[model samples]
Target: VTRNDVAPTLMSVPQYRPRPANPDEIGNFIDENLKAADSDPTAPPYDSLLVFDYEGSGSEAASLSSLNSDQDQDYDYLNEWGNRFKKLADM
Candidate 1:
C-alpha cells in the first residue's frame, strides 16, 4: 500500500544577463577589438635590412669505378649457370 506524498516545491530562477540595461554592451564585451585593448603593444617595424651574395666553391667529382665492379663478376657467374641449365634442358 502507498501513502500520498506532497509535491516538490518548484524553483523560480530568474533569467541572467550581465548587461541587461544595454543588450549591445554584452555583444561588444566579447568583441575582439575590445579584448585587444588589454593585450601587449605591437612590435616596432624593421628598418635598413642588409642583403648578402652567395659564392660557390668548385670541387672534383667522386669516383664510381668500384661501385659496379663486382656486378660484372656476378653477371659472369649468372651467365655460366644459365648456360648449364640450357645444356641440361637440351638433353
Candidate 2:
C-alpha cells in the first residue's frame, strides 16, 4: 500500500534506459519517480511501473497518437516499453 503522501503526478519522458527484468532492476526508475512524486506531501506520484496501451496504428491521420509520430513511425519501440520495461522480458 502507498502512503498518504504518495499519489499521482505527471512526468516527462524518461531518458532511455534498458528495461528492467525485475523490481530490483527498476530501482533507479523507482527513485526518480519517488522524487518526481513531488514535495507536496499532500500528493505524490507512485514509483511503480505503469503501462498505458498505445496504438501501433492511429486508424486516422489526425489522431494524437504518439506511436503514429513521424519519428516512432515504423519502429516498434512500444514493444520495448511494454515487454522490456514492464519486466516481461530481459535486456
Candidate 3:
C-alpha cells in the first residue's frame, strides 16, 4: 500500500551530471555531446584534463572520495549555501 499524505520524497541519485533524468536521457546526452565535440574538434572546451588519481596514502593525501566534488560543492563558492562542505570534517 501507498500513503496519500506524503508530500516529499528522497531518492538515491547518480554520481554525475549534466544530470540525466533517466537512462534514455543519459544515452541521448552522450550522443549529442559526442557529436558536438567531434564537430568542433579544436574549440575552447576541447582542452584536455589532467586525469590523475587524487591523494594517495601520504601525509597530505587523504580519502579522495571525501573530496565531495559531487555534493554541496557550490557551498564554499557561494556564502548563501553555508557550511555544507565535507572538506572540514575529519574522517
The per-residue C-alpha lDDT of model 3 at residue 54 equals 62
Q: What is the C-alpha local distance difference test score of candidate 2?
A: 0.53
lDDT of 3 by residue, 32-53 (tens): 6676555553333333334466
Cα lDDT of model 1 overall? Answer: 0.46
lDDT over C-alpha atoms for residue 32 of model 2: 65
Q: Tell me each candidate's TM-score.
A: 0.17, 0.19, 0.24
Q: Can you rank all candidates by lDDT, best first?
A: 2, 3, 1
lDDT of 1 at 84: 62
**TM-score of structure candidate 2:** 0.19
Better of 2 and 3 by TM-score: 3
Shift in Å, residue 29, candidate 1: 32
lDDT of 1 by residue, 1-91 (tens): 3334343334333333344466677676556444554442332232333444446677667875764324443333343565567665454
**Per-residue CA lDDT of candidate 2, range 1-91, in tens?**
3333334555353344556688876988667665645444434345555455655775666757586325444534545665446553332
User: Per-prediction count of colliding residue pairs?
Assistant: 0, 1, 0
RMSD of 2: 34.5
User: Scored by Cα lDDT, where does model 3 land?
Assistant: 0.50
Q: Which ten residues in a row have the lowest lDDT in candidate 2?
A: 1-10
Which runs of model 2 end up more than 4 angstroms from their true locations? 1-19, 40-91
Instruction: Order the candidates by TM-score, highest first.
Output: 3, 2, 1
Relative to the true structure, candidate 1 reaches a TM of: 0.17
